[PDB]
Structure formats: C-alpha cells, structure tokens
Design a protein around this ligand. Structure first.
Ligand SMILES: *[C@@H]1O[C@H](CO)[C@@H](O[C@@H]2O[C@H](CO)[C@@H](O[C@H]3O[C@H](CO[C@H]4O[C@H](CO)[C@@H](O)[C@H](O)[C@@H]4O)[C@@H](O)[C@H](O[C@H]4O[C@H](CO)[C@@H](O)[C@H](O)[C@@H]4O)[C@@H]3O)[C@H](O)[C@H]2NC(C)=O)[C@H](O)[C@H]1NC(C)=O
Ligand SMILES: NC[C@]1(c2ccccc2)CC[C@H](OC/C=C/c2ccccc2)CC1
Ligand SMILES: NC[C@]1(c2ccccc2)CC[C@H](OC/C=C/c2ccccc2)CC1
Ligand SMILES: *[C@@H]1O[C@H](CO)[C@@H](O)[C@H](O)[C@H]1NC(C)=O
Ligand SMILES: *[C@@H]1O[C@H](CO)[C@@H](O)[C@H](O)[C@H]1NC(C)=O
Ligand SMILES: *[C@@H]1O[C@H](CO)[C@@H](O)[C@H](O)[C@H]1NC(C)=O
Ligand SMILES: *[C@@H]1O[C@H](CO)[C@@H](O)[C@H](O)[C@H]1NC(C)=O
Ligand SMILES: *[C@@H]1O[C@H](CO)[C@@H](O)[C@H](O)[C@H]1NC(C)=O
Ligand SMILES: *[C@@H]1O[C@H](CO)[C@@H](O)[C@H](O)[C@H]1NC(C)=O
Ligand SMILES: *[C@@H]1O[C@H](CO)[C@@H](O)[C@H](O)[C@H]1NC(C)=O
Ligand SMILES: *[C@@H]1O[C@H](CO)[C@@H](O)[C@H](O)[C@H]1NC(C)=O
Ligand SMILES: *[C@@H]1O[C@H](CO)[C@@H](O)[C@H](O)[C@H]1NC(C)=O
Ligand SMILES: *[C@@H]1O[C@H](CO)[C@@H](O)[C@H](O)[C@H]1NC(C)=O
Ligand SMILES: *[C@@H]1O[C@H](CO)[C@@H](O)[C@H](O)[C@H]1NC(C)=O
Ligand SMILES: *[C@@H]1O[C@H](CO)[C@@H](O)[C@H](O)[C@H]1NC(C)=O
Lengths: 733, 727
C-alpha cells in the first residue's frame, strides 16, 4: 500500500470530518450543509432549511462568517476579514433582515470594526470601532456611543491590548452582556506607559521602504497596562445625552500594587462576579457585585469576597478558574486545587468563605460543562487513571457519591477523549470523541442519557485510510522516583521491536503542557513515521499538567530546569527500551518547545545528534510579563533575577559544538520576537559554532501562511532526513 | 608540503608586509617602525628618530592614529574611535606640542568629533562637532564657531550625509582648505525631506527591547538631499561677531532641477573649481570661481565654465573626474572619454572650451598622479594591452610624444600592477607593486627616474610560502564577437589540464568593475584552490571597466542583462576548455556580485549546480538614488520603470528549483538593506523553492566583525564543499 506522505500532510489529502453545530434553543440546533444553513430537531433528527446558500452570493463580497441573532430575526455577515494577533482581527459587517428579506444599508456597522456581538437574547448589538464601544438597539437604527476615550495603542475600551488578548482572556473581546441583555459590562485598558516592541514589516515587493510595526508589549518586569471595569444599562440610553457607565473598582487588596482583571462572569440579571489577580500571580480575589435600584450603581459587598491563593505556585492552570452559578446566583461551583494539590470541584455559598469539595481523587476535573437544578456535568481524566484521556461525568447535586460516567463505556477502544456541547437548558448533548480512533460525533438526550443517533463517524476517511500504511500510536508511562510519567510514540507501520529505528522527540514541556494523550492526529509526525520510518515520541515530565500540583508546580520560579532534564531522561529511557538507534535521536519543538529543544541541545548530554528550534524563547526577560512572571516572578535582585540570568539559551552556546542545530523564526513574530533567535544566533557566532538557520519574511508565530507552512515542513523534513541518513528522491521540477 | 588552509586565511598566518610612508617635504618621509616614528632622507636612506615610542606611555588611552601638522610643530592623537558608515566615525582628539613637550589641556577638540583636519600649511585646525564647523587658529586658543544650523539627521555642515558619503565623495568630510589655509570651503547638506530607512538593532543580550535605527537614505526615485556650498575667510574671524560664510551658488543649468555637488578642487589661493552633476547623471558643469578682493564675494564667470556630457551613458567612471591645475591655475588636465570612448588625459586652458587630448589609444588612463612644472605622471593599463595591469608613465607638458614608462620594465615577471606615492614636489616617488608576484615597495628619484633602494620585498613571506603548496594564477582572454573579454583563474597546486576540477565563479560584474587583474592576493579563493583543489575563476564581461565605453556603457539603463548573460557565457567557455567538471560549477558574490549571482542562478541556464549570494541587491527600487539612477535613470513610467520591474531577482524565483542556493545577509546592513534578501526569500517561499539561509545579527554590509567574518567563511566553505562532494 501507499504511505502517508509529506504531500498528503501539506495538501490535506485525508480530511477529518467535523460536525459543528450551534444550539439555538433547548431542542434545536443550526448546522451548515452544502453552504445552506439547516435547522435540526434534536429529538427526531428531521431538518428544515433555515437559510439557502444562494443568499450568501447576493452581496458581491465573499462572506468569512455569519452570526444569527438569538431570536433568529437577523444575520450578521462578516467580510473583509483582516487578521491581527492570535484572536484579534478587523472586518466589515452587514446585517440582513430575515423577516423583511432584505439587506440593511442604513446606520451600518463601520468598516475596520474590531469586535461585534449580539446580545444573548433578542437582537441588540455591541461593537468596538477605533477603540470605542457602540450599542445598536435595533439593526437599522443609529448607534449610541458608549465611550469617547478610545485611542489607538493607548486606550482600549471593550477590546484587549496585546498581553490581555494573548495571556489573560484568550480573546480580543472585553465586552460581557448580562444574561437577558439589559446590561453591558466592559473593561478598559490603558497602555500609556507600556514600552513598544518595534520590528520591520517588508510587505509586497512594491513597498519601497519597509514599515516599522510598533506594539505596546510589556516584557518581563516592564510597566504593565492598567485596567478599569464598567457596566452600562443599555435599556436607558438616550440620543440626547451621553451614556453613564458605572465603574466597579478592584478591591483594596489589589489596588495596593500592580494587578490584572482575570475573569468576568455574570451570575444573574443583576449580579456579576469579577476575579482579580495580583501581578505576583499567587493571590486572587473574587468580588460579587449586585445592582442597586436606589443608586443605579453596583455594590460589591466585602462579605462576599472569595480569596484564592497558592503557596506552591501560581493560581489556576493558566489563570483562576471560572465560577458556575446556580440559577438564583446564591451559590456557585468552581474548580480549585485541593489539599493534595489535585484540581476538583468546590461548592461555595456566596456569603460563606469555606467551600465544600464535591469531587476528590488522584486525577483532575478539566472543566465544568453544564449545571441544572439536579445535576452538574463535568469532564475529567479519572477513567482508567489515564491523565491524557477525557470523559463526561454527571453528579447528583443531592448526593455526591452518585457519579455516573456518560462517555467511558460508549466505545472504549475507539473513544477515550471527549468534549461536549449541551443544548440551551441541557435537554440534549452532542459528544465529540477525538481519539484514539477516528473522531466520532453523536447526539444524546439528558433525561435518561439515551443515545439518539450518530452525527458523523468519519466512515469516508476510514475507507481512504484502509489503503494507506498508517502508523500506530502507543500511550504508556515510565516510573521515575515512584512517580508515573506518561509518554506517547507514533510508531512506523509494521513496527518491529527487534529493529533499531531513529527517534525524534517532539517537545512542548511548558507549564501545564500535555503532549502524551489519546487524541487521533494527522500531522507531520504521521508522515515521519509512515513514510520515513521514524519513531516520533513525546513525554510529559515535571511541570506538565492535569496530574496535580506536585508535578505542575515542580518548575515554579525555575523554568529551564526540571522540564529540560526530564526530556533528556525520557530520551535515555527510550534508548533503554531496545528498539531505538542511540546514534539517531533528534529533538524538535516550537515556542516553549523551541526553548526546551535549545536548552537540551546546549546541555552537553551527548544524547541528541541534532535538533530544530522554531520561534524559541531564548531568555525570559524577552518574553511578556503575564506569562513569564506567572512562573518566574520578577527579574529583580530581590526576587528572581539570578534564575532569569541562569536560564538563557545563549549561556549554553559553547555546547552547541556537539550537535547539528536548525534555528527558524518568522521576522514579524509579535509574540516570541525575532530578537530571541537573533540573540541565539549572535551567541553561537561569538563562540564559533556552525549551525543552520532560516528566517521567514513577514511570518508571525504561527508560520501559517499556506506557502510558508509548506516551506517550513519541507525544510525541516530535509534536515531530519539528512541527520538520520535517510535517502532523498528526485522530482521532475 | 602543507596547503594554505581556511584557518591560515581566517587567522592571517601568512602576512603581506607593507611600507606605509608619509611624505613631509620634497626630500624626507616619516615611517612608523616598532611604534617609533622615524624621519628618512630619501636620497641616502639614513634616518633619525622623529618621535620615540615612549613619548605617550602615560597617555591613558589606546591611540588609534595620529596626524602631524604640516609645519611639524604639533601632533593630533586620535582615540575613542567609534565607526559609523564606510568612511564616517567619531573620535576624541588630543593635541601635543612637539617643541614644548606639552599636551594641550585647554580649548580642547571636543569628544565625539565627526571630522578634524589641519590646514595644508602651518597648524590651523577645522573640525565638525554636532554637525557644525569650528576653526582653531592656534591649538591652545578658543575655537571660532562657523555654522549654527547643524542638526542630527537633518543639516550637515562640513560632513556628508549617508548617500554623499557612500556614493559621491567616498568620505565623511565635506571641508576643503585653500592651499595656504586662508580660506575654508565647505558643503552643507539638507536631508529634511529624505525618507528614513528603519531597521532593528538588537545589541548586547542585556538590551530588553531592540532599538530601531533610522537613517535618512534616498532609495531610487525618492526625495534627495539638497546641497549648498560656502567659503569662509579664516584670517578675518572675530571673537566679537559671527563668521560670514560666502555662498557659491550652482549654475542655473543645475538649479532648474535636482542636482549634486560632485567635486571640489582648489586651483590657486584665490580660485576654486566646483563640479556639479544633474540628477540625470549624463550632464555635468565645472565652475571656476575667483575671489573678488573689492566685494569679498566669489564670482564664477561663464567664460571659465566647462560642460561634460555623455550621449551613451553617465559622466565619469563613477563620477566626473578631478581636474589637476597648473600652479598658476590658468590651465588644467583631466581624464575625459575621447571620441572612440577611451578615457584619456585632456589639457584645458580655463577660458577655452575645446580641450586637447595628450594621450590616445585603445587603453585607458586610470589616474593622474602628479603634475610638475615639466611633466605629468599618470597610471594606465597601456602596457602589453592588458586592461588588468597598471604602470606609471610620465609625459612632457611641452611635447606629448615624449612619454616614458617608469615602471613597465623594472621587474616585468614579478610586477605588472603598480600604484605610486610622490614627495611634496615630486622629486621622489615610492612605487608599490602589488602583483603578480609578492608585493614589492621601492624608492626612486624623479631627476632621471633612477632606483634608489628596495624598501620592502616580502622576503620573510617568500621564505614561509616556500613550504606551502600555493595555487597559481592565470590571466587570459576569450574572444566573443571579435572582442576580447578577460578572465582570471586561481588554479590548484600541481594543476593538471588532463584532469577535470570543480569550478567556482567569483563575481562582481557591476558597472566599471574589474575582477580579472594581475594583483597577488591571499584570500578565501587561495584556500579553495590550495586545500580544496577548486578552480576559482572571475570574468569581466559587458559593463566592466577600463576597456572603453563600448564595453562599460553596454549595460546603460539595463542592469541585470548583459553582465548576467556574460557570466553564464564565461562558465560555458570554461567548460569548453576541457579541465572543468561541468557537473560541479558554482557561483558566488557579495553586493552587486550577490545580485548577479542570484540573477544567474535564476536564469534557467542549467550551467550552475549551486551558488551563494551575500548581501545582494534584489530590486533596484530598494537601492540608493545616486548609484542606482546613474545606470538606471528614474523608476517612472516616462523614464525606466519597465526595466526596473523586469530586472528583479524575485521575478526569477521559479527557476531557483534548478539550483542549490545559500542566501546570507547582515540584519544591520545600512547599505544593501536586509529588506533586499527578505524579499528574495519571500518570493522563493511563495513558489515552493527550497534554499539555505543565514542572517548575521547586527552585522552590516561588511559582515566584518572578527567572529562574524570567521563564521561566514566557515559556513560558505561547508556549503561549497557539500555542493562539490569534498570531504
Ligand atoms: C642624513 O645624512 C645627511 C648627511 O650627513 C644629513 O645632512 C646633514 O645635516 C646636517 C644637520 O642639518 C648639516 O650639518 C651642518 O652643515 C653645515 C656644514 O656643512 C658642511 O659640512 C658637512 C659635514 O659636517 C657636509 O655634510 C656639508 O656638505 C658641508 O660641507 C654647518 O655649517 C651647519 O651648522 C649650522 O647648524 C648647526 C645645527 O644643525 C648649528 O649647530 C651650527 O652652529 C650652525 O648654525 C650644520 O652643522 C649637514 O650639512 C648635512 N649634510 C648634507 C645635507 O650634505 C641629514 O640631516 C641626515 N638625515 C636624517 C633624516 O638623518
Ligand atoms: N503565550 C502563552 C503560550 C506561549 C507561546 C510562546 C512562548 C511561550 C508560551 C501560547 C498560548 C498557550 O495558551 C494556553 C491556554 C490557556 C487557556 C485558554 C482558555 C481557557 C483557559 C486557559 C500557553 C503558552
Ligand atoms: N555603493 C556603491 C558600491 C555598491 C555596494 C553595494 C551594492 C551595489 C553597489 C560600493 C562602493 C563602490 O565604490 C567604487 C569607488 C569609487 C571611487 C572612489 C574614490 C574615487 C573615485 C571613485 C561601487 C559599488
Ligand atoms: C420536525 O418534525 C416535527 C413533526 O414531527 C415538526 O413539528 C418540526 O417543526 C420539525 N422540525 C424541523 C426542524 O424540521
Ligand atoms: C466601507 O468601505 C467601502 C469601500 O471604501 C465603502 O464603499 C463603504 O461605504 C464603507 N462602509 C461603511 C459602513 O463606511
Ligand atoms: C492613562 O494612564 C495615564 C498614566 O499612565 C494617564 O495619564 C491617563 O490619564 C490615563 N487615561 C485614561 C483615559 O484613563
Ligand atoms: C458626549 O461626550 C463627548 C466627549 O466628551 C462630547 O464631545 C459631547 O459633546 C458629549 N455629548 C453630550 C450630548 O453631552
Ligand atoms: C432583564 O433583566 C432586567 C434586570 O433584572 C429586568 O429589569 C428586565 O425586565 C429583564 N427582561 C425581561 C424580558 O424580563
Ligand atoms: C507569592 O509568591 C511570593 C514569591 O515567591 C512569596 O513571597 C509569597 O509568600 C507567595 N504568597 C503565597 C500566598 O504563598
Ligand atoms: C571627554 O570625555 C572624558 C570622559 O568623560 C572627559 O574626562 C574629558 O574632559 C572630555 N573632553 C572634553 C574635551 O570635553
Ligand atoms: C532645509 O530644507 C527644508 C526643506 O526641505 C527647509 O524648510 C529648511 O529651511 C532648510 N534648512 C536649512 C538650514 O537650509
Ligand atoms: C551668532 O549666531 C547665533 C545663532 O544664530 C546667535 O545665538 C548668537 O547670538 C550670534 N552671536 C553674535 C555675536 O551675533
Ligand atoms: C595666502 O593666500 C592669501 C590669498 O591670496 C594671501 O592673502 C595670504 O597672504 C597668503 N599667505 C601667505 C603666508 O603667503
Ligand atoms: C541623458 O539621459 C536621458 C535619459 O536617457 C536622455 O533623455 C538625454 O537625452 C541624455 N542626454 C544626452 C546628452 O544623451
Ligand atoms: C554577440 O553578438 C550577438 C549578436 O548581436 C549578441 O546577441 C550577443 O549578446 C553578443 N555577445 C557578446 C557581445 O558577448
């Protein structure tokens, strides 16, 4: 049979089918089929055409995405999409009136709009344009301007700045509608004193002078953005007077120094919760604020504050977890690290500071998925004690011992990694199995957890793959100091334990990372194993996630130590297994994985022949404040400067004489600045070490344009094949 | 025997000795030996100590260079040297009184001085600090501030901006003292509307945020700097009132549009010549301006104005040539292209517009070296009709038939490439032979052109090289269309014509370039031939210099055409010779050579297996106005935009699928911006071509720091050895 080739990976020859649905009520969902939008009845599976595909070709522009208003009366059409950072972008928007069957051409949403969202009920709109918030009560009516302070690179109303987008909210939006749309809450960021990262952008060859891009970006220890929080009543807006936004200030325990706003969650129509985090990220406070009809303001009762702190590390996996409120808003459930360091669900009364754990054990709750008056639904890695598996469970709120696994036994050989999507009041749920077999999407009814139907089983892909020599995946563990550490191996087809294969260690190894799991993937590793007969291994060592704080917090204030040593030890253990050619072990990684790859290659271990670092961090003072300081503290003599100075790639330059290294970086990387690799290369040149390099003009952290993505994987494949003494092949052109 | 290795090249194991002297009169010169400065009598060769190496033992700073005042009374000590561009730098200066044995401690030259020069006689000083000119009449006395308009990156008084430094004057200074030091002439450049090139500078690893460097740099067709010219009388300066500078305006034929000041040459104590060039560089005007004692003004009479134009190309090799005036300033000699397109010496009377050619032939005069009362001394490539040779000649002013070759027959097998250094009134001259044998420095008397003595013969290097398997050099020509085109080959030791060797074509090929010559060099090519047994060839095709305008102007308005095609043809002709392995032909070059290498690799010729481009130009709109427009005109639809768009490397990207390419560039290149290689790589990625790259953090066009220089040649050697399958 044929193998899974590099061209198969780069041209997406073998495509994974999805079943992306959008719940619109407790019994119906929308699903896009052959460019038409269909509405499905969950109980019976029958459908009706909601919006014909022809409608999308009526405007003359190509439509990037759509958003139907919750009441189904309007459709927001997104076009002229222009990407900014990981989540941010600008676009033009048109609104189509579904009952009048006509495009709205008056009081349009402006071009270069930064963010738009419908209210959660009805059809109000809030949008951000030129860093200011606007609200439209009706799609054809003039907007009400909420803020007047917006200023490019300085004041951000209702949108995040660079560091809040990447590191705090994982979103460009900083707008939160109340459940029924009466109130609009928003954050305002002030970057006045934040230094700018500056880099060249070359653009099309017609551009005679390169542009200098300047982005407010706080590097470790630098001046951070400041934040304010406001709530506006959208039902009392006037065309005669400016809108009154009510400020909610941070608690004084936060105002004493630098801090962040890290979570916004509405509890009821008149109650909002906010979580704040100190700049030293081991102390956070939740405020619960109620609307006061007598003053028109928001009161955050001091008696309702909840403190969450950590003595061994930072708070949360990446940030404090979100609360899930009961309907009355008087209690909530939240994932918290317990006394043993395992993340479990805790039940709180809004006026009481001691919470009660409702789950326990040497495993962790990943997320709370739905909450009804009778049950709480959650995803955990409890099943078979496999940290890299995921299953859906339900717990009776009247008896915590009554826990049922909803997904564990549905198809145990094919499905060990689930996510879920519940209908509006959780009468139904879609289960999404992503491995170890081909992804499988199914629909279920909550009343008795009855399976209704299979939505997508990837039978088309299965038929195609029967004719390909596909690799296999092994997930297992090694024991180090009486602790299990998990690894995975992508094994070549017809794997023979009596033969010696070359091995590539694929690394991430950042705090809370997980690279050993049960997910089915078709990626570069699939080609390396299928066509090139390379074993591609990954290992989750100290600092990795979902296995408790004793493992995750092991690298607290000490990045570039145990997680680096544990990758080296894993490669030694893989050599001890007997089917690995110890003369052909390589390592590669991107981002944090590029940093770890570089630290490993500079260790002088003698284990690795070669390695590739893509967009690596090289020195923690070059990376952003929020992520870096979470694990490293501040780069000051009084805090952790000594470790910042001891954990650079540059200090290990002399040891690179022992290895073959390929260093790759996009010149327009706004995230891990090209500076980081420019300093690695300069250090290697300064000690006389030869190495290979590749810059990618105008590519960012993703090196994700169609042509650059094909080019980088082609270049890396040649490098690994040459390191491993694997043959080349001529092609006509 | 051992070979000449890469470490020998990088560590300078085998050193070429020089003999750098400084003439102080018509009979004596200074020579630095064992840090002592000696004064030599040219006639007899005896010496005396001028300044002992112990004088400045307690100075407290490492001295970079020195400059003795023309009257020998003072010495300027340069220290704290900080490089800027190719020529520019700043430094600190101390003045030491050689008679009193005292360092000047008051009214010192400021730190961060941009330029300093003694007057040509005596000991006045002019300097530029913070873009303004200052004059000191005596080293211990306060300075007179001449200009008050200087402003970083905007107004430059007495110093050049980036483009005038690189492309017009080949110097940072823009100050010209009159012969006896009475007047100080200077240019002022105004870069207000010139766009800025911006690039990152990463600095030491301790720098948390990269710096953005911003330099006023006009790319092709962009707004250029403007220029003004002034003359100040330094004998009538006052501590009470500000100095009066007299402006000399450009002629109306220049003021009608954009133009450049391209030459300043004093003719007498009261007469200065200026040459101006239109932005379309095929028309130049020389004004001869006289001081008017009655008005205090400088007048340039049209009766003494001379035009120089070209109908086939630009004016001059790189710019209009310098005039050499007779002592009375009533006539001058200048190299001009003749009716046949060969550059020869023309004699002009200041008020007569038709000049008389004093030399002629199918060869060219390279430079006028000295003009005495009876003879003119010049360097040419006449000898044996070899364009890549250089010899010194003299011609009698009253009889152009009385020519003597002064260097041709001295040592004809060892020496075919000379330069010269004459004493103050040319009674003596030092000849400097740079090849084809080991360099040889000798001293001569011009009384009857008799040799006095050998100054340095490199016998120490010769003894060391006898134990090394050194390569040889062949210089010859091929005939194409009844025209000779010259090439050179660096041949491996024990070269066997019956065997096939890999070949590397080392390219420059820019307008007026010459890569085939008789110079002896110890460089990367020496290692490739000596250790790796690679033939390193270079070829001078259309557009090359010193062979007349029919060859040089062949690429006018058409860069990236004939000079590219002729490198490909040369490699085909080298294959036709029989000792070349046609499966192992590579090409490399730096700067314009990187552009030609890239254009050749993108040609689809199938001749070359691999190549390396270092800091290449990729598209002429990215390079500076003065150099680019000289050959290309303006990038406008009405002028030459179509050819600017047709001559890019990016347009050839698909053809790179046929070759192995290594692209290298310094990130802080202020000259050929990193942008140029960033656009090549993006075009190759866009068509799915694999290639090799290397950036050099914070390196400029020279990639010349000790560590980066060693790294780039090591990386390139690995690449060529892998291309040629050499262990
Ligand atoms: C290289 O060697 C050259 C040859 O010796 C050096 O030239 C000589 O320089 C000295 C000093 O400048 C000259 O000295 C005296 O010259 C006359 C007398 O000249 C007669 O006698 C000389 C031998 O003693 C002969 O060489 C002459 O040809 C001639 O017959 C004196 O009258 C001078 O006296 C005056 O100056 C001195 C100070 O220098 C005072 O002390 C006296 O009181 C008086 O005022 C000189 O003593 C010498 O003439 C000259 N010889 C030449 C050129 O032939 C040359 O300097 C040296 N170069 C270097 C760099 O080392
Ligand atoms: N910039 C940080 C990351 C990075 C890149 C480059 C160098 C170093 C590090 C990239 C993103 C990633 O996000 C984790 C997701 C968190 C999340 C999201 C939603 C809800 C809860 C948590 C972590 C590593
Ligand atoms: N920037 C132009 C040059 C260049 C670099 C990079 C890309 C393209 C081109 C470099 C310098 C060089 O100068 C020649 C010398 C002229 C001269 C000097 C003194 C007196 C008379 C003539 C020509 C090519
Ligand atoms: C599905 O069928 C029922 C009748 O059994 C009907 O009421 C419902 O509207 C249908 N839904 C869709 C989306 O077609
Ligand atoms: C958006 O831009 C287009 C193109 O310039 C313009 O025609 C249109 O009117 C703009 N729309 C709005 C809402 O301003
Ligand atoms: C932003 O912060 C700066 C201080 O860094 C302050 O001067 C300015 O008033 C603030 N602007 C707003 C709109 O809050
Ligand atoms: C609203 O605020 C803006 C900005 O401060 C101001 O220009 C405008 O006049 C205000 N409008 C009213 C109606 O007060
Ligand atoms: C939405 O909530 C607000 C605040 O309690 C309330 O005044 C309003 O009536 C609610 N809307 C509806 C439709 O009940
Ligand atoms: C938070 O971290 C700092 C730095 O390690 C430490 O001084 C402080 O005590 C920690 N706080 C808690 C709650 O442990
Ligand atoms: C130059 O700088 C040094 C060091 O600061 C200082 O001592 C000296 O006085 C300065 N010279 C002048 C002329 O200002
Ligand atoms: C420099 O030129 C600008 C116009 O480009 C002009 O405004 C300015 O006055 C000039 N400055 C001097 C000192 O000549
Ligand atoms: C000289 O010119 C400068 C700059 O215009 C001025 O400040 C100074 O007063 C002038 N001095 C005299 C004496 O005129
Ligand atoms: C220098 O030349 C000028 C101009 O002719 C003259 O006035 C001056 O006196 C000359 N100086 C000497 C020392 O002869
Ligand atoms: C100078 O060059 C331009 C452009 O080629 C041309 O129009 C003009 O005629 C030239 N002048 C001469 C004297 O050839
Ligand atoms: C030789 O002449 C031919 C015919 O005109 C031309 O195509 C070719 O470019 C010339 N080659 C040279 C001058 O090297």
């Amino acid at each position: 049979r044929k193998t899974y080739t590099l061209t198969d990976y780069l041209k997406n020859t073998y495509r994974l089918k999805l079943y992306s649905l959008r719940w619109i009520s407790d019994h119906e969902y929308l699903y896009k089929q052959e460019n038409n939008i269909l509405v499905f009845n969950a109980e019976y599976g029958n459908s009706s055409v909601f919006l014909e595909n022809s409608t999308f070709d009526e405007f003359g522009h190509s439509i990037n995405d759509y958003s139907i208003s919750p009441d189904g009366q309007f459709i927001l059409l997104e076009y002229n999409y222009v990407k900014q950072w990981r989540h941010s972008y600008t676009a033009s928007y048109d609104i189509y009136d579904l009952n009048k069957r006509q495009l709205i051409t008056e009081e349009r949403i402006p071009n270069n709009t930064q963010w738009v969202t419908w209210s959660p009920v009805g059809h109000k709109l809030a949008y951000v344009w030129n860093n200011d918030i606007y609200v439209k009560i009706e799609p054809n009516l003039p907007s009400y301007r909420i803020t007047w302070t917006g200023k490019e690179d300085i004041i951000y109303n209702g949108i995040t700045d660079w560091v809040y987008e990447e590191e705090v909210f994982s979103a460009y939006s900083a707008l939160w509608w109340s459940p029924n749309g009466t109130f609009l809450a928003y954050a305002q960021f002030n970057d006045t004193e934040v230094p700018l990262i500056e880099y060249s952008f070359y653009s099309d060859e017609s551009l005679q002078y390169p542009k200098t891009v300047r982005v407010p970006y706080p590097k470790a220890g630098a001046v951070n953005p400041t934040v304010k929080f406001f709530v506006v009543n959208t039902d009392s807006l006037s065309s005669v007077t400016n809108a009154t936004s009510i400020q909610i200030t941070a608690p004084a325990s936060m105002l004493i120094g630098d801090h962040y706003l890290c979570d916004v969650t509405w509890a009821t129509q008149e109650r909002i919760s906010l979580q704040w985090l100190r700049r030293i990220q081991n102390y956070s406070v939740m405020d619960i604020c109620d609307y006061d009809e007598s003053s028109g303001r928001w009161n955050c009762l001091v008696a309702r504050q909840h403190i969450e702190m950590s003595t061994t590390g930072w708070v949360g996996r990446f940030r404090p977890s979100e609360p899930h409120f009961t309907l009355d808003g008087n209690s909530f459930y939240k994932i918290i690290s317990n006394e043993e360091g395992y993340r479990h669900i805790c039940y709180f009364q809004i006026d009481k500071k001691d919470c009660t754990f409702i789950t326990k054990g040497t495993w962790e709750v990943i997320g709370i998925e739905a909450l009804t008056s009778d049950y709480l639904y959650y995803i955990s890695n409890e099943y078979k004690g496999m940290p890299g598996g995921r299953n859906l469970y339900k717990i009776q709120l009247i008896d915590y011992t009554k826990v049922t696994c909803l997904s564990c036994e549905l198809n145990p050989e094919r499905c060990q990694y689930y996510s879920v999507s519940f209908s509006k009041e959780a009468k139904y749920y879609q289960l999404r199995c992503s491995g170890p077999g081909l992804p499988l999407y199914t629909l279920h009814s909550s009343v008795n957890d009855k399976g209704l139907r299979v939505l997508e089983d990837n039978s088309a892909l299965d038929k195609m793959l029967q004719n390909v020599q596909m690799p296999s995946k092994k997930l297992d563990f090694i024991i180090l100091n009486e602790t299990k550490f998990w690894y995975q191996m992508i094994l070549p087809p017809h794997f023979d334990k009596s033969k010696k294969y070359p091995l590539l260690l694929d690394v991430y190894a950042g705090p809370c990372s997980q690279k050993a799991d049960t997910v089915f993937r078709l990626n570069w590793a699939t080609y390396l194993a299928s066509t090139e007969n390379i074993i591609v291994a990954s290992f989750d060592g100290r600092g990795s996630g979902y296995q408790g704080d004793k493992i995750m917090h092991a690298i607290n204030r000490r990045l570039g130590t145990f997680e680096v040593e544990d990758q080296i030890e894993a490669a030694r253990q893989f050599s001890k297994m007997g089917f690995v050619d110890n003369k052909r072990i390589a390592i590669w990684g991107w981002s944090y994985g590029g940093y770890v790859t570089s630290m490993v290659l500079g260790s002088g271990s003698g284990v690795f022949k070669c390695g590739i670092a893509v967009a690596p961090v090289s020195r923690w003072e070059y990376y952003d404040s929020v992520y870096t300081e979470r694990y490293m503290g501040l780069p000051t003599p009084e805090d952790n400067l000594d470790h910042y100075r001891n954990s650079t790639v540059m200090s290990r330059a002399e040891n690179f004489k022992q290895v073959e290294y390929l260093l790759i970086h996009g010149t327009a990387d706004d995230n891990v600045h090209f500076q980081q690799s420019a300093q690695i290369s300069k250090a290697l040149v300064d000690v006389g070490v030869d190495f290979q390099a590749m810059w990618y003009t105008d590519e960012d952290h993703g090196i994700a344009s169609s042509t650059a993505h094909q080019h980088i994987y082609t270049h890396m494949s040649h490098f690994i094949k040459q390191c491993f003494s694997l043959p080349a092949a001529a092609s006509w052109s």
